[PDB]
Point group: none
Chain length 255, copies 4
């Protein structure tokens, strides 16, 4: 298999090294060679990082300058920047005052107000870097499915659309963080059955109560609990679509 | 014989359709732009017994070629459509070989190696998607599990949602408000009254438009299963187009 | 490289078996290996175990004897390959094909003068790779021991396997010896006593002096560690296993 | 820029790449011919930046012209070209205050050429990773101090040295020499001179002296528990390799 010198095709300029690390990370390559490339760029050891992505406000060069300056002004010294289609993605090393919300606020003006903007969670090491860049890429590709997107879009806002695009990270989160959390450890717990039944029956409290032989208030209470544990409120049309998707993922995976 | 067939099967199931695969298929006797279809399900008794029953059933129907493989608990068979070998007739002949207590799928007829791969893969994805539905048809309908197949990575299910649902809904002309109405209706969780209020139109106008959409697409936004299918299609179309 | 690239135009089950074997032996557990195993008839999260040793007469003879034995026991699939002087067989466990019975059945086909190993039952391609590799590494490690058991015990050659690069052996030392003994208590009297004892080369006197306790206090703590881990630090072999585990744990935990 | 080239060469060497491409890169950095070099590694006392600065200043003051500096995990590693007064102990003494006193420090032997440079950096990395195993680490750690633990981590240089410089040296060319048998028996019998002597029908003192001879040829003294562990490891490596 190709070594880091093969990958570099004789180049030693950091622009090429950066673009190469960017493409490796975006394409899910997290092996030692990528660790070496990030090493060369200055990303030492088990670093923390996060990503911001969107469409440049005026130009790619202008946005890149703005982002490097903002990272510098906040006490950081590493940010890997690359383009993907019309999108510019930036992976910042979390150090000094470079933290996600503050960094996102500082660079927002360099991104078009007329296009989606996404801020990733903090992730660790090269594998996290790849994760941050990919969830950012998939979120931006998924954003058009959303009627009224937050700005910036954050976190798990686009799970089902990301899953539809083939994002393994989104499938896994729907399985682990929604479906499996709903199920819990106790199989006699009624929450999962109640959410499932509620969705099946048109998001009707009355029909769910009728189906399950419980008081409507009891269904209400269970849905609220499921909202607390998963972050998704079945009574909200957007969240209900997310939950429905999670149940499909879970059922296909477990049977 | 058997070994080459199993290798061809893996290649097809894993979406390898390049000339090396064509050449394997040539060796097996599948020539040119052949027609084929697939059938899949859980064996009534055993994988070996079901394989045999399918081979024999196809042979008796004048067929000479079948490629049989496994995916998890499922037996998947690709049959070359020759002689009296047709999908429905073949399916009927082999149903005893598949358990009544598990899903079953019969693909449409497809052509060539690309077609063979599609037939086997849509069969795998359909069987895999089935647990998502409470009471699926037997055999599973081709249009029954599109969002679920898409979620698994079935690119043909994505395309079908795009072409047969989203683009059909959107139509030739931008002025037609049927699409906007369905879009808005889904956004508001299939609330007739909230949709009429939001669009500033009469609720009857909303009902009429939803019925039109149900007629042209085959999906009724007032049914929660169909609403999910529609919502999936709009997402796919919006991500693809803009 | 896809499965066809790996095959290099071969479509014979013999080359396919050899390729699957080599992938497993080199710790490749990805989709292509799953497909290769698919092709050989190994579907899903199967159970399997491995047997390995030096053939009593010939590879061909031992292979024939193994395939016969497995079939007579009602088994369908056995992947057989060779590494150096060793023959390794991976059997699908089903019907009456279970590890001890199978091992007993095929013992006559392996040299008495050479080590023999039977793996635990494991599952899936990852399990198959693990079983074949622990078998390889155990056979390679055996010469380090003067009179090992036959077959070799799963826990008998951990440091030596680890020295050869066997990551499962490192893991097992870390989890089953080091962690079991230390927990979150570097200051637990037993752990501290074992640690100090080894540091002083198993000298009861020097250890008691260093810890400022009575020798009998050192003795019962070592006895506890022995009962807890199965390793008795007063035995030079066991002491070497314990020392290796402590090094592994320390390097890993910081 | 220069920093980039240097970090690239560092990564190649650390990753055991010693091919013509790497040789050429080192040549461009100014490392030419069959140069002598050594490595020092540890944890920066204050920061990566300031430790690097202090190392380069020390090497400059000592009359040296070339140092390649990189990181592994929390470690800073420096490869120095041996020239002027840039020699291992002097250089180590000059740069030691730049490394944390609460963390291990390692100084490699002198090595030759690009292959030697790669060897020096890797034995340094592995030794630093292995250091926590040691109860009473010297400062700096040196040379072959961590052989068995390095072998446990998969360092091929350690496995090779255990076989070549320890196990093979014990055996020598003469099967009439009792060194190997004595070391072997002594370890087997729990480092008991009395029981070893009883087994070999020899006086305890003869056993002791034979072990001291082994210490002369290999540097490892079986009467010391640390060294006994190292020797036990070398026997295992050797026995596995010769069958």
């Amino acid at each position: 298999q190709a070594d880091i010198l093969d990958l570099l095709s004789g180049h030693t300029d950091d622009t090429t090294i950066e673009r190469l690390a960017f493409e490796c990370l975006l394409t899910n390559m997290t092996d030692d060679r990528v660790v070496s490339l990030m090493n060369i760029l200055g990303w030492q050891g088990d670093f923390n990082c996060f990503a911001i992505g969107g469409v440049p406000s005026a130009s790619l060069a202008s946005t890149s300058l703005a982002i490097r300056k903002a990272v510098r002004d906040l006490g950081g010294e590493h940010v890997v920047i690359g383009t993907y289609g019309t999108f510019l993605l930036a992976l910042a090393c979390q150090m000094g005052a470079v933290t996600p919300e503050v960094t996102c606020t500082a660079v927002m003006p360099a991104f078009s107000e007329d296009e989606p903007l996404y801020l990733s969670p903090v992730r660790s090491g090269v594998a996290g870097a790849s994760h941050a860049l990919r969830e950012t890429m998939f979120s931006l590709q998924a954003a058009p499915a959303l009627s009224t997107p937050s700005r910036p879009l954050r976190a798990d806002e686009l799970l089902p659309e990301r899953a539809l695009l083939g994002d393994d990270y989104a499938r896994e989160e729907l399985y682990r963080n929604v479906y499996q959390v709903l199920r819990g450890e106790n199989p006699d717990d009624p929450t999962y059955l109640t959410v499932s039944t509620f969705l099946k029956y048109g998001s009707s409290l009355e029909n769910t109560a009728k189906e399950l032989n419980v008081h409507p208030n009891t269904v209400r209470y269970r849905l609220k609990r499921a909202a607390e544990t998963t972050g998704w409120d079945a009574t909200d049309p957007r969240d209900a679509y997310v939950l429905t998707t999670a149940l499909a993922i879970g059922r296909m995976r477990d049977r």
